[PDB]
């Protein structure tokens, strides 16, 4: 299927951005005293 | 001939002639392999046969 | 627009003779092709044959012609196909075949007239959309 | 090149006439006397080499060929086009209303 | 590319679920 | 397939009889409260 | 002691992190078979001849579809009411082909959810709860039999189902407004009124306990930290949320009585929706929407059209569209 | 056009012990209409995965 | 003794065709001064052979074996014509009407679907010379027409077609038109077919016949959009021949 | 410049997978008690 070049870095920037700052923040919750 | 047995007889086959980053299988390179075209004997003016 | 005596004016033969219908006779006309007819002809065209209508035009190329009150009155005691070369009473209501289609056991003289002045006025009202099918609607 | 032929035969007498040798059955409806019984023999010997042969279908009353001989200028014929007379679609072309 | 991708979002959606169910914060009555 | 077909047949007819065996097992009296 | 006795604790305990339960007997692996089946045919299924005339209709995402355009295909027209199941097929490449795996997938999707309305009843007997829960999960499941059952059953085919997937779902909802005019139909519209309403009143009630919060945190905590799981008192100030909402409208339309606004909160969208179920379900016999069609005329006999006749225009074009090369007689019966 | 020609890495370590055909008929020596049984390329595959 | 349609739905019996005895080992005689028909030919497939497309061009191709995945749903049957008797004694049959196509789909190894007409329309198809009975060394081998497996009215998934349909691609408005005439310009087949009938039973005393056929024709060309491939068809045949 | 397709894909994530590795370990050292 001739679909969008962009396509594929778009979905996986779009996932991983927003996810990776959830991780960061939940991680450095559970070190905290 | 066999075109299978002419087919190992070409050095696109080789798997010293590649490159670290030519990703990807052999037909990315050289094509898919379609046919042989047969044995090609080169001569001179003269008629002799030349390799 | 209204209803008018030239709107409700119909032929009446072949040779050109006219009938003005009243207001009750078109009333009368509806109601009994309703009763009678629309299961098949429903605004016009014929469902269990698309090919023959009810438009004016076409009835006047029917053999014998049926585009007047006597042709319809005719085509429903003993109808015939387009071309007048068959008897069809026993596919097709009428008065002939009214053991088999019970529902013309009680039709008169009188409501074959009111059914006839239906078919011919109501194209006078709707124009193509007489005959025209889903494309019209 | 490559070209739809029932859009080229719309360019022929097809697009003016009644065929005998390709159209629907049903078109025959569009002069008097002509449908059924007429319509059915027509397509059923055609082709026809021209408008004439249509006299030639065996069995006709003498009023059968007085309607055909009346209706002949109204016909035409050219060459049978398969996609238009397969299918049985001379009887049933998929068009009702 | 398009199926590994749309596949693969799926894949870690069902993942997630397994998290979610078994690894829950567990409610505690305080 | 006609193993295929046995298969399931033997497989759904195990779990249906643990279903009517198993609500036949007293389930009235399986509640927290008065025992039936 | 015994191992059936044992068993039988196991299945109908009460400790176990997913409840089992007799239903989840059933439940269980009817729907892992229904998943399973569904996630497979979803990748990687050939092209399925939904209408029985030999044209293929492609969903899976190896076939060339995305999220959006791929299903699970309704099995053939051919088969129609006909049981399918794969030991019918002379071989899995005639089963695909005609699209078995939509039997498959619904049969036990629907049987697993029955089971697991049953389920819901059966563990709130076991926790000593009111039984009622299952009776709120009737409505969506009754929505599901009317899509993937009734109506295959009633118009005489399973490829008339709705198919499994997001354009096969936009498919199946034109066509039967073609078939049906169903945004005419009332248990239609009691259904928009029951999901529009849902919507409303969760909007309102979440709305109306969130701004009567008791104040128990911080300027910089989240105000969730005001409520501890499992205490006694209630969270928000009911008293002071029916004061507001009784003066925005008036005292007698808004409700004091928590047990009365939780029932009404759970009967307007099942209501609704069983109206909606219905809809479907008798829409299945062909018993359709309201047909205003030319009902206003002048007094020559002149139609007048009303907006009824524009939806009937656009029901039209659906109509003479939809599966383009199936029907070869004037009328759509079924 | 063998598999080497096409980068294919595993397919030649599932021949190499005897899995040379798939439940879609072909066979890796070219045949047509081989039932390979269960354990196809598909069936090792599918095995690995559960 | 006689089966009714209840003792035979859904057995797939119903596409099948008769069979005789092995005792049917007969001869029908030939009256070349009566005429005779064919009231009744049936063809039942029992193999669907479609042949391989190789790269090399110059290896010669061979017939593969194929998945049928229509199901019971491929005979002819109900077909009947004249029987005339030649004047060097041969016979000749020219099919009039029946149930003589059927869509067939089948599936190559590694999925490709090939769909055909399975067909005998317009047969005509002749013996040897000096056929005074109808004997178990009797052959009938002719030719029958293949037209579009689908019809003139048949539209494509974006609405093309030939009798009717869009005559462009509408989804891309302004694309250049000459890469896609193969795909918008819709062309109807009409393609000749072989067949070869070997009687292998003969029933003297009803005019019954039974054999082995194997028929070849190309398969759905899609109106015009790709090239068909090549089919061999095999299967067993019963006819019942009557004086007219 | 005719470059790989994936070229950029292959870029993004060799950047961001072990950075976002080391940025997740930096910010929870910070968050521990001090
Ligand atoms: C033993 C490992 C191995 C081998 C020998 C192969 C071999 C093959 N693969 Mg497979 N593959 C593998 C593992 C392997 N694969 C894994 C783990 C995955 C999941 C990611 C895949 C997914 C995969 C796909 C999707 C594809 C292949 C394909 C292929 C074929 C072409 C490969 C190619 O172009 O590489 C090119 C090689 C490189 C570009 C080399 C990378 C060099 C790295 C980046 C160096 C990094 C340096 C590092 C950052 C420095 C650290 C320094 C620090 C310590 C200071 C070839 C037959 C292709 C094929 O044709 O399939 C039919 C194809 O499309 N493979
Ligand atoms: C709880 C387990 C369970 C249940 C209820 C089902 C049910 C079904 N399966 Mg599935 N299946 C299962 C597990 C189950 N499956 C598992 C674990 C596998 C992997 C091996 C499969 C693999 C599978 C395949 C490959 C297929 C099915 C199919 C079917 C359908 C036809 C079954 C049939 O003909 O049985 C007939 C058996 C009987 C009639 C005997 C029942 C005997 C009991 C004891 C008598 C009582 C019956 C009566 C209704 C009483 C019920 C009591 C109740 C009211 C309280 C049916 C939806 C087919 C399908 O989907 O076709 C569209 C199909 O092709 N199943
Ligand atoms: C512009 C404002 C507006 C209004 C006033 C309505 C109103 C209505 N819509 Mg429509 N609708 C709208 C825009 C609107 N719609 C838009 C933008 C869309 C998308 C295009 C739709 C799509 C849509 C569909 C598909 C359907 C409706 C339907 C309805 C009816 C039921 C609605 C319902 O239960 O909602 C939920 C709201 C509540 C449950 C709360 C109460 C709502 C009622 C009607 C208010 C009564 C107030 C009262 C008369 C005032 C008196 C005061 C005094 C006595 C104190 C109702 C007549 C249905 C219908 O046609 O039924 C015949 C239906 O099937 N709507
Ligand atoms: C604003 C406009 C509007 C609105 C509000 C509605 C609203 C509705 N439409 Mg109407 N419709 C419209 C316009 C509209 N429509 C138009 C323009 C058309 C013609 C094109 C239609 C034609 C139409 C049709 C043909 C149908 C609807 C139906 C409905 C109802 C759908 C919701 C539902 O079925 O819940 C019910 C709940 C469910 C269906 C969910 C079942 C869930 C099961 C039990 C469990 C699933 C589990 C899942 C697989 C896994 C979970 C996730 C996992 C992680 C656990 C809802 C009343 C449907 C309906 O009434 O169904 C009865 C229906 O069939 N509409
Ligand atoms: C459970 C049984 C089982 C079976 C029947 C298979 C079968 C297969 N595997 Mg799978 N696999 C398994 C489990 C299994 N696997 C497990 C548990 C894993 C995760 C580790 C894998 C991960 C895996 C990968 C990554 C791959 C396979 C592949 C394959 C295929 C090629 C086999 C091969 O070349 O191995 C060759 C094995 C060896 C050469 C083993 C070497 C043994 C060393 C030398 C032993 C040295 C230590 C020993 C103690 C020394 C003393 C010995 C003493 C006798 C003196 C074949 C279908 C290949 C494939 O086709 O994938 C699709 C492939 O690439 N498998
Ligand atoms: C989160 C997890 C990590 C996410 C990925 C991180 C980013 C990826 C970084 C690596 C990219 C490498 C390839 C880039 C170019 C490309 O597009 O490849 C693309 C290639 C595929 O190749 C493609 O194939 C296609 C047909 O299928 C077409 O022919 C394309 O033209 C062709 O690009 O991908 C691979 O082959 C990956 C497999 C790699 C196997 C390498 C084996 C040897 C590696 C040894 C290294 C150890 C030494 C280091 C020690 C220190
Ligand atoms: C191809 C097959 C190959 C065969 C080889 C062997 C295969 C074995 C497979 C076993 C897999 C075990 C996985 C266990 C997971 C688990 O739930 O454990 C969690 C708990 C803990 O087990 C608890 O375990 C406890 C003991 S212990 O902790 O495990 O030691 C025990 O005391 C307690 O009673 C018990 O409930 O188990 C339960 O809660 C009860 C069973 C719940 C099963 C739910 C299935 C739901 C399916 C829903 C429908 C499909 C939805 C699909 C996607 C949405
Ligand atoms: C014209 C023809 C002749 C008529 C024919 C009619 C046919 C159909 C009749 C249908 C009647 C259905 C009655 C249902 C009663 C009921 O649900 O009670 C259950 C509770 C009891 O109410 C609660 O009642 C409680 C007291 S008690 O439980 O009733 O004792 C009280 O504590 C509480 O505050 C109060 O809310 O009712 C409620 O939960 C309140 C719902 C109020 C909804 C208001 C809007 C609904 C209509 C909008 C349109
Ligand atoms: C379906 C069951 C019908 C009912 C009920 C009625 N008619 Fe009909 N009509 C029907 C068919 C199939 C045909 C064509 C028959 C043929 O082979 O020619 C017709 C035709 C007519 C016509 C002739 C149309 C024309 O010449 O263009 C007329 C005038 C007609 N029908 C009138 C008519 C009336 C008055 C009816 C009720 C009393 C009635 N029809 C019922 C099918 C059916
Ligand atoms: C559809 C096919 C099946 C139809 C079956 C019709 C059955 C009609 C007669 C039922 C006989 C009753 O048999 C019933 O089953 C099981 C196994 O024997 C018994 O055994 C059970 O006893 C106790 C009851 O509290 C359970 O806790 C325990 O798990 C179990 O061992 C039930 O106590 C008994 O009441
Ligand atoms: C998890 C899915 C299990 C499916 C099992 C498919 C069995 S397939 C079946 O069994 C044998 C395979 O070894 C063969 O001998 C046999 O010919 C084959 O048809
Ligand atoms: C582990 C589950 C396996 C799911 C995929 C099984 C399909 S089998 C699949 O079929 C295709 C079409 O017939 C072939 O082209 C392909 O070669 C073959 O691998
Ligand atoms: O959700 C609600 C809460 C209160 Br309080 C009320 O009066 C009405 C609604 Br709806
Ligand atoms: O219209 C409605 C009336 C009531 Br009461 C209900 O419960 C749901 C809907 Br929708
Ligand atoms: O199939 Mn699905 O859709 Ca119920 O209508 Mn008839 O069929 Mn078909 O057309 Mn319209
Ligand atoms: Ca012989
Ligand atoms: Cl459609
Ligand atoms: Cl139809």
Redesign the pocket.
């Known amino acids: 299927m001739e679909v969008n070049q962009l396509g594929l870095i778009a979905t996986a920037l779009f996932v991983l951005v927003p996810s990776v700052f959830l991780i960061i923040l939940y991680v450095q919750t559970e070190s905290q005293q | 001939i066999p075109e299978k047995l002419a087919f190992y007889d070409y050095i696109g086959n080789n798997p010293a002639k590649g490159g670290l ?1 030519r ?3 052999m ?2 390179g050289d094509g898919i392999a379609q046919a042989w075209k047969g044995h090609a004997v080169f001569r001179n003016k003269e008629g002799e046969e030349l390799f | 627009a209204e209803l008018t005596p030239e709107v409700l004016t119909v032929p009446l033969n072949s040779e050109g003779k006219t009938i003005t219908l009243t207001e009750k006779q078109y009333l009368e006309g509806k109601r009994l092709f309703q009763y009678a007819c629309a299961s098949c002809h429903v605004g016009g065209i014929t469902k269990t044959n698309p090919s023959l209508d009810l438009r004016t035009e076409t009835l006047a190329l029917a053999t014998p012609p049926r585009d007047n009150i006597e042709g319809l009155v005719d085509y429903m005691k003993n109808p015939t196909t387009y071309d007048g070369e068959q008897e069809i009473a026993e596919v097709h209501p009428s008065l002939r075949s009214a053991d088999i289609f019970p529902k013309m056991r009680n039709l008169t003289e009188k409501d074959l007239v009111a059914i006839a002045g239906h078919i011919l006025v109501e194209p006078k009202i709707l124009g193509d959309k007489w005959g025209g099918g889903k494309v019209y609607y | 090149e490559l070209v739809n032929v029932v859009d080229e035969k719309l360019g022929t007498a097809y697009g003016e006439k009644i065929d005998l040798n390709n159209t629907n059955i049903a078109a025959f409806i569009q002069y008097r006397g002509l449908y059924p019984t007429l319509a059915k023999l027509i397509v059923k010997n055609a082709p026809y080499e021209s408008v004439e042969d249509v006299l030639n279908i065996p069995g006709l009353t003498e009023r059968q060929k007085q309607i055909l001989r009346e209706n002949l200028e109204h016909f035409t014929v050219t060459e049978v086009e398969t996609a238009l007379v397969e299918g049985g679609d001379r009887y049933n072309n998929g068009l009702y209303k | 590319m398009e199926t590994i991708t749309y596949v693969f979002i799926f894949a870690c959606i069902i993942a997630l679920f397994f998290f979610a169910i078994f690894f829950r914060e567990p409610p505690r009555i305080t | 397939m006609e193993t295929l077909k046995i298969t399931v047949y033997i497989v759904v007819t195990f779990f249906v009889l643990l279903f009517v065996f198993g609500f036949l097992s007293g389930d009235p009296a399986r509640n927290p409260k008065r025992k039936d | 002691a015994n191992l059936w006795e044992r068993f039988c604790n196991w299945v109908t305990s009460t400790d176990n992190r997913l409840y089992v339960g007799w239903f989840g007997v059933i439940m269980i692996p009817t729907l892992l078979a229904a998943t399973i089946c569904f996630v497979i045919a979803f990748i990687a299924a050939p092209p399925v001849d939904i209408d029985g005339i030999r044209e293929p209709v492609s969903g899976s995402l190896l076939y060339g579809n995305n999220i959006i355009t791929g299903a699970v295909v309704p099995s053939s027209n051919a088969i129609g009411l006909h049981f399918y199941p794969i030991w019918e097929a002379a071989s899995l490449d005639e089963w695909l082909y005609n699209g078995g795996p939509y039997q498959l997938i619904i049969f036990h999707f629907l049987l697993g959810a029955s089971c697991y309305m049953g389920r819901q009843w059966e563990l709130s007997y076991r926790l000593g709860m009111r039984p009622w829960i299952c009776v709120a999960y009737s409505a969506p499941l009754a929505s599901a039999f009317a899509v993937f059952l009734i109506y295959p059953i009633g118009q005489g085919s399973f490829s008339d189902g709705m198919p499994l997937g997001i354009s096969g779902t936009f498919n199946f909802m034109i066509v039967f407004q073609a078939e049906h005019n169903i945004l005419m139909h009332p248990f239609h519209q009691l259904g928009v009124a029951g999901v529009f309403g849902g919507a409303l009143f969760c909007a309102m009630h979440g709305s109306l306990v969130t701004s009567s919060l008791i104040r128990e945190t911080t300027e910089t905590e989240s105000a969730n930290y005001g409520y501890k799981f499992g205490q006694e008192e209630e969270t928000y100030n009911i008293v002071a949320a029916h004061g507001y909402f009784g003066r925005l409208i008036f005292q007698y339309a808004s409700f004091n009585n928590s047990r009365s606004l939780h029932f009404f909160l759970a009967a307007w969208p099942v209501v609704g929706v069983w109206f909606a179920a219905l809809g479907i379900s008798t829409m299945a016999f062909n018993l359709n929407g309201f047909n205003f069609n030319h009902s206003v005329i002048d007094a020559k006999g002149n139609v007048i059209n009303t907006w009824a006749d524009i939806i009937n225009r656009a029901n039209l074009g659906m109509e003479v569209m939809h599966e383009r090369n199936a029907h070869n007689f004037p009328l759509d019966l079924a | 056009n063998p598999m080497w020609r096409q ?1 294919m890495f595993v397919l030649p370590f599932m021949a190499r012990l005897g899995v040379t055909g798939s439940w879609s008929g072909w066979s890796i020596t070219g045949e047509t209409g081989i039932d390979p049984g269960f354990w196809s390329f598909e069936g090792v595959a599918l095995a690995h995965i559960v | 003794q006689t089966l009714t349609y209840d003792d035979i739905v859904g057995t797939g019996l119903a596409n099948k065709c008769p069979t005789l005895d092995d005792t049917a080992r007969g001869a029908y005689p030939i009256d070349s001064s009566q005429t005779y028909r064919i009231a009744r030919l049936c063809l039942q497939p029992t193999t669907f052979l479609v042949k391989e497309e190789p790269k090399n061009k110059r290896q010669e191709a061979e017939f593969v074996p194929t998945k049928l995945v229509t199901r019971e749903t491929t005979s002819l049957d109900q077909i009947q014509g004249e029987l005339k008797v030649n004047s060097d004694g041969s016979l000749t049959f020219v099919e009039e009407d029946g149930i003589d196509f059927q869509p067939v789909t089948v599936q190559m190894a590694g999925g490709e679907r090939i769909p055909l007409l399975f067909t005998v329309k317009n047969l005509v198809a002749s013996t040897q010379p000096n056929v005074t009975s109808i004997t178990t060394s009797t052959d009938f081998k002719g030719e029958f027409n293949v037209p579009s497996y689908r019809t003139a009215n048949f539209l494509d998934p974006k609405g093309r077609g030939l009798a009717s349909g869009y005559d462009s691609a509408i989804a891309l408005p302004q694309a250049k038109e000459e890469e896609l005439a193969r795909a918008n310009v819709k062309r109807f087949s009409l393609t000749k077919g072989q067949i070869s009938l070997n009687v292998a039973k003969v029933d003297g005393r009803t005019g019954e016949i039974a054999g082995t056929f194997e028929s070849e024709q190309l398969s759905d060309d899609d109106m015009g959009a790709h090239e068909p491939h090549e089919v061999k068809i095999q299967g067993v045949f019963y006819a019942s021949i009557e004086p007219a």
């Open positions: 980053f990703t990807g299988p037909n990315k | 980068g």
